[PDB]
Enzyme design. Structure first.
Site, PDB file in Angstrom:
ATOM      1  CB  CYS A   1      -0.928   0.021   1.210  1.00 44.10           C
ATOM      2  SG  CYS A   1      -1.959   1.504   1.297  1.00 44.10           S
TER       3      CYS A   1
ATOM      4  CG  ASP B   1       2.862  -5.935  35.964  1.00 43.51           C
ATOM      5  OD1 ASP B   1       2.318  -5.173  35.139  1.00 43.51           O
ATOM      6  OD2 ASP B   1       2.904  -5.692  37.187  1.00 43.51           O
TER       7      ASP B   1
HETATM    8 ZN   LIG Z   1      -3.496   3.133   1.788  1.00 41.96          ZN
END
Ligand SMILES: [Zn+2]
Ligand SMILES: [Zn+2]
Lengths: 218, 309, 223
Positions: free
Chosen positions: B27, B162
């Site tokens: 992307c 923790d």
């Molecule tokens: Zn994107």
């Protein structure tokens, strides 16, 4: 020059100009001197992903060949174009490590590493080959891998991963591939313990890729 | 999202399924890539301090700058003593560059830990006592070395139980290492790092350490504890569990890489199964670490969705 | 004939093989015709990546070349000069196509906007590395593209937005005069927003996409 050529290679990786990294880096091996344990990784990373660019592109153009109509001829000649560049660069690294590296590492386990490369590069030719060359190439590939034996070490697992996938993808014999991969995986996960000084950062991944490749083949 | 086809020339993972990706997509605005079969190859590789988390902490001393902390409420019963001896029987064996050396156990009853403290502050100090101004690339580096430590803990199936920002220590920017690891025997201080799933009440999941690490990234990116003005823990603690509240992703500094905001966002996933495991996180951080040199100081005109579906 | 040359380009693109894609499209310009908007688009994306892999590479080299002996230093710089030399050549190549085969035939209203914009961008990269009055040469190319586009295209048109974006970052990155960048970016954002009452159904994406990149840039300059 040797400090330099490795210096340019070290930059060329950061520049992602891997083609120029290979052209430089093999200039080190053509010195005929032994590679350091660093230089070996720089050589292998250069040529692998330089071929990587050709393998992925060959897969894509071949895929859109298969999905294809007179354009088929253009696609086919282009597939042969990318195949020759692939074949030609692959012959180079083969000729290099046959001509120099394998005969000059005696009882350094780089002697394994260079046989594994010889296997891998014939394996890449076995993806390109058609029926004729394929057996002639594949015989040479398996001789390399089957000889490439000396236990959690990344290379031994790396061979087992890579070699088992050779049996699956090219011989198409899942019994061997599963047999190898599961065998080698157990001999890892039953043992471990080396991991931190081993740089588990590597060996766990290959160990995992065995598990999930088995999960693909099963 | 907009996409381009990309060969990944380096170890990288498919965000939908966290498996290795050699070939596929990126992307172009987000790095996220769809999971679009082939077998994988081998990749390329190249004095008192306080009650503490759950053990009262002292700046003890013995040969090797070993600090000390003591059991809190859990009695030194033989069953728990044996479990502690077994957990010590891991930690006293493991040594790793981003982990503080576990040196041994105090032989007396009311068990106590002897472990090295390295000078340079707790990470809590640089965040909340100062907010020490330093280069963002070092923020990534801190996240890398902490993550690469946690990666070995998980590579050894040590679960932190923790994990807190306070238990992370910097060698005056030389390095960061992890304390307060393991020693679950004593568990059951203060809590904003508990995963929502755990505060809905194996809460020390292998993936619960992921969420706590997620809170650390927020503090790095924002200079503060989460919930800047809803500070009543006991008020927010249940409702950050019940589904109301999660840290404000908008408070991050405007010059951070979008992907690091994204990494935090996936890290903070409530539903446990696909909070990303730390090898993938490491690869994501490793991508950021060199992406920040690559990325321009200001954006530009991309190739317009050129190779999306 | 271009049905053939252009097929290789479309093929080379998804083969991720841009160095080959840009050569075939160059011969597409050798026909001297007005390119259809698709083969016009391919040409822009071909040369964008063919510089992009090298320009972004040049950034890493010049980043490592920050650090301080001589052998490492002179090699680092020598390598930088090589990658810079490569960038300078392919830049001057595209400008020759623009000067000699595209701009002189960009008869359609938008067409000349696209090529003049690109003449801007490529001079921008060259002055970025380069004595470099080429900064002003890109300024002229953008100003020409902006002067025309201000009249002959819709404020929501993706090229008008995309021109405005590139031109604003030119004022920022190259002239370091961010108020000028603020001026362009704020106008172009607001004007397209004022025109959101109509969008072409694909421009719908590209416009909103580019607008969001423009709004991002405003932040880093405004903060
Ligand atoms: Zn994107
Ligand atoms: Zn995937």
């Amino acid at each position: 020059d040797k400090n330099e050529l490795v210096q340019k290679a070290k930059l060329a990786e950061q520049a992602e100009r891997y083609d120029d990294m290979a052209a430089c880096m093999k200039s080190v091996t053509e010195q005929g001197a032994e590679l350091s344990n660093e230089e070996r990784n720089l050589l292998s990373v250069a040529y692998k992903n330089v071929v990587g660019a050709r393998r992925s592109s060959w897969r894509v153009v071949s895929s859109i060949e298969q999905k294809t109509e007179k354009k088929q001829q253009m696609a086919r000649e282009y597939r042969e174009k990318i195949e020759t560049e692939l074949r030609d660069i692959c012959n180079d690294v083969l000729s290099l490590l046959e001509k120099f590296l394998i005969p000059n590492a005696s009882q350094a386990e780089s002697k394994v590493f260079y046989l594994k490369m010889k296997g891998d590069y014939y394996r890449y030719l076995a993806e390109v080959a058609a029926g004729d060359d394929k057996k002639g190439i594949v015989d040479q590939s398996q001789q390399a891998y089957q000889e490439a034996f000396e236990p959690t070490h990344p290379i031994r697992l790396g061979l087992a991963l890579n070699f088992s996938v050779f049996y699956y993808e090219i011989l198409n014999s899942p019994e061997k591939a599963c047999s190898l991969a599961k065998t080698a995986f157990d001999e890892a996960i039953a043992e471990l313990d080396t991991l931190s000084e081993e740089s588990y950062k590597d060996s766990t991944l290959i160990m995992q890729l065995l598990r999930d490749n088995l999960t693909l083949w099963t | 999202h907009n996409f381009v086809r990309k060969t990944f020339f380096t170890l990288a993972f498919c965000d939908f399924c966290r498996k290795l990706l050699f070939q596929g997509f990126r992307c172009q605005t987000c790095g996220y890539k769809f999971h679009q079969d082939r077998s994988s190859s081998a990749p390329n590789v190249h004095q008192r301090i306080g009650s503490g988390s759950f053990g009262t902490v002292y700046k003890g001393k013995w040969h090797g700058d070993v600090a000390v902390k003591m059991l809190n409420v859990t009695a030194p019963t033989p069953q728990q003593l044996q479990a502690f001896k077994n957990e010590v029987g891991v930690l006293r064996k493991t040594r790793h560059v981003n982990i503080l050396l576990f040196m041994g156990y105090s032989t007396k009853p009311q068990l106590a830990i002897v472990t090295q403290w390295c000078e340079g502050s707790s990470l809590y100090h640089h965040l909340h006592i100062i907010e020490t101004k330093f280069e963002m690339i070092k923020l990534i580096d801190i996240a890398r070395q902490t993550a690469q430590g946690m990666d070995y803990l998980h590579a050894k199936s040590i679960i932190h139980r923790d994990l807190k920002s306070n238990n992370i220590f910097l060698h005056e920017d030389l390095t960061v290492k992890i304390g307060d690891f393991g020693l679950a025997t004593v568990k059951s201080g203060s809590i904003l790092w508990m995963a929502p799933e755990v505060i809905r009440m194996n809460p020390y999941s292998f993936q619960s350490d992921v969420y706590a690490f997620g809170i650390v990234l927020y503090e790095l990116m924002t200079g503060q504890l989460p919930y800047s003005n809803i500070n009543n823990r006991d008020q927010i603690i249940f409702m950050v569990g019940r589904g109301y509240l999660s840290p404000d992703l908008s408070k991050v500094r405007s010059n951070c890489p979008k992907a690091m905001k994204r990494l935090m966002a996936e890290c903070l996933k409530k539903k446990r199964d696909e909070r990303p495991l730390f090898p993938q996180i490491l690869a994501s951080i490793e991508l950021l670490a060199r992406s920040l040199p690559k990325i321009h100081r200001s954006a530009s005109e991309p190739s317009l969705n050129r190779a999306g579906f």
